[PDB]
Scaffold this active site. Structure first.
Site, PDB file in Angstrom:
ATOM      1  N   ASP A 160      -4.852  -3.396   1.780  1.00 49.62           N
ATOM      2  CA  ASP A 160      -5.326  -2.412   1.745  1.00 49.62           C
ATOM      3  C   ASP A 160      -6.904  -2.529   1.375  1.00 49.62           C
ATOM      4  O   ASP A 160      -7.317  -2.770   0.290  1.00 49.62           O
ATOM      5  CB  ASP A 160      -4.739  -1.353   0.869  1.00 49.62           C
TER       6      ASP A 160
ATOM      7  N   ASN B 244      -7.033  -1.696  -6.407  1.00 54.54           N
ATOM      8  CA  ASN B 244      -5.945  -2.260  -7.287  1.00 54.54           C
ATOM      9  C   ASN B 244      -4.786  -2.859  -6.688  1.00 54.54           C
ATOM     10  O   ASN B 244      -4.433  -2.936  -5.195  1.00 54.54           O
ATOM     11  CB  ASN B 244      -5.408  -1.086  -7.973  1.00 54.54           C
TER      12      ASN B 244
ATOM     13  N   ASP C  91     -10.296   1.447   6.958  1.00 50.49           N
ATOM     14  CA  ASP C  91      -9.047   1.390   6.333  1.00 50.49           C
ATOM     15  C   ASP C  91      -7.922   0.736   7.006  1.00 50.49           C
ATOM     16  O   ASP C  91      -7.635   1.106   8.108  1.00 50.49           O
ATOM     17  CB  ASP C  91      -8.850   2.580   5.782  1.00 50.49           C
TER      18      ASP C  91
ATOM     19  N   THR D 207      -4.431   2.409   6.830  1.00 49.20           N
ATOM     20  CA  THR D 207      -3.937   3.694   7.570  1.00 49.20           C
ATOM     21  C   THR D 207      -3.557   3.198   8.923  1.00 49.20           C
ATOM     22  O   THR D 207      -4.429   2.535   9.650  1.00 49.20           O
ATOM     23  CB  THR D 207      -5.079   4.481   7.469  1.00 49.20           C
TER      24      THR D 207
ATOM     25  N   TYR E 267      -2.641   7.783  -4.054  1.00 48.83           N
ATOM     26  CA  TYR E 267      -2.683   7.493  -2.815  1.00 48.83           C
ATOM     27  C   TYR E 267      -2.549   8.891  -1.992  1.00 48.83           C
ATOM     28  O   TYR E 267      -1.994   9.683  -2.340  1.00 48.83           O
ATOM     29  CB  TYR E 267      -1.946   6.282  -2.434  1.00 48.83           C
TER      30      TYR E 267
END
Length: 326
Positions: A32, A37, A215, A218, A75
């Protein structure tokens, strides 16, 4: 130069395998660029999403170092609560040592349960890293495990093989033309300044400039509800019996190209790219989703877009390079 192959799952999600601990315990995680993280489920989590996937076991790792830090993340799809700890992570042929990641304790929600991946691996800026947790790529750099302070991403199409995340490198064989660099407006997400979204010469959205983020986490090309309605109406989207944005498949050949202007350059999208389909029904590749920011209603250049353009993330020059795929 680190090489990390990604499995393309139904043109909607892209995950890869990493290894954690000694011996290495395997987990499939999503790379991602909208997150920062790294976390995977653990034997401390009793949620249904955890029982559903691979759980990391601290006890069976010899290079594991525990910490006294709580971790929490929310998220757009789900949430997670965990604890932090150090151990060796293996990403694309590299032994990312002294890497701090999270161990879920609670992965509540229906979404994480049906997902095929065990966890997530953020590639964005440490700015947006919950708990000030040093992100993976930042850790690879600090320890001189990558030659250059950048990485590029390539996503396959039509459920194909070939998706790859090159760590600390660029590879001309994936693109054509010249890389057109774009400066990062705000360091946190890989945010960029869109100039406009047009179609047939007329501006149909983001008129006057707007913000967007690149992103990989997505699937669809996202934007404010308001603006997407217009777009949808222009391509022929419609709400059917199952709350979905469908369009007469055959319309593809008819439909025109929607163009994105980034940093003064034009990056078009073919009706074959912004329209997903199967040998059954054709869905709209767009999806309205308001994302409030200090700057405004944010746009999200998801997988629909990144499949058409090889993308470089330069953490040294804080830019985003793009070029039509090969």
């Amino acid at each position: 130069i680190g090489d990390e192959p990604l499995e393309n799952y139904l043109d909607t999600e892209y995950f890869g395998t990493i290894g954690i601990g000694t011996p290495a315990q395997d987990f499939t995680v999503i790379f991602d660029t909208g997150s920062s993280n790294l976390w995977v489920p653990s034997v401390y989590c009793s949620s249904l999403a955890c029982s559903d996937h691979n759980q990391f076991n601290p006890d069976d790792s010899s290079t594991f170092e525990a910490t006294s830090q709580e971790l929490s993340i929310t998220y757009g799809t789900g949430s997670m609560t965990g604890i932090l700890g150090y151990d060796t992570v293996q990403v694309g042929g590299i032994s990312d040592t002294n890497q701090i990641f999270g161990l879920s304790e609670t992965e509540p929600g229906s979404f994480l349960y049906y997902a095929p991946f065990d966890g997530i691996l953020g590639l964005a800026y440490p700015s947006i890293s919950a708990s000030g947790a040093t992100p993976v790529f930042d850790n690879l750099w600090d320890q001189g495990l990558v030659s250059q302070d950048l990485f590029s991403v390539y996503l396959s199409s039509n459920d194909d093989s070939g998706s790859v995340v090159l760590l600390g490198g660029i590879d001309s064989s994936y693109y054509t033309g010249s890389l057109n660099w774009v400066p990062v407006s705000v360091e946190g997400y890989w945010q960029i300044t869109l100039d406009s979204i047009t179609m047939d010469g007329e501006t149909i959205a983001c008129s006057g400039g707007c913000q967007a983020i690149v992103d990989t986490g997505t699937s669809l090309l996202t934007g404010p509800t308001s603006a997407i309605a217009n777009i949808q109406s222009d391509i022929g989207a419609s709400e059917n019996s199952d709350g979905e944005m469908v369009i007469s498949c055959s319309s593809i050949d008819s439909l025109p190209d929607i163009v994105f202007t980034i940093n003064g350059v034009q990056y078009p999208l073919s009706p074959s790219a912004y329209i997903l389909q199967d040998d059954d029904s054709c869905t709209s590749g767009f999806e309205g989703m308001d994302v409030p920011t200090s700057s405004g209603e944010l746009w999200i250049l998801g997988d629909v877009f990144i499949r058409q353009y090889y993308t470089v993330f330069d953490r040294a020059n804080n830019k985003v390079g793009l070029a039509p795929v090969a």
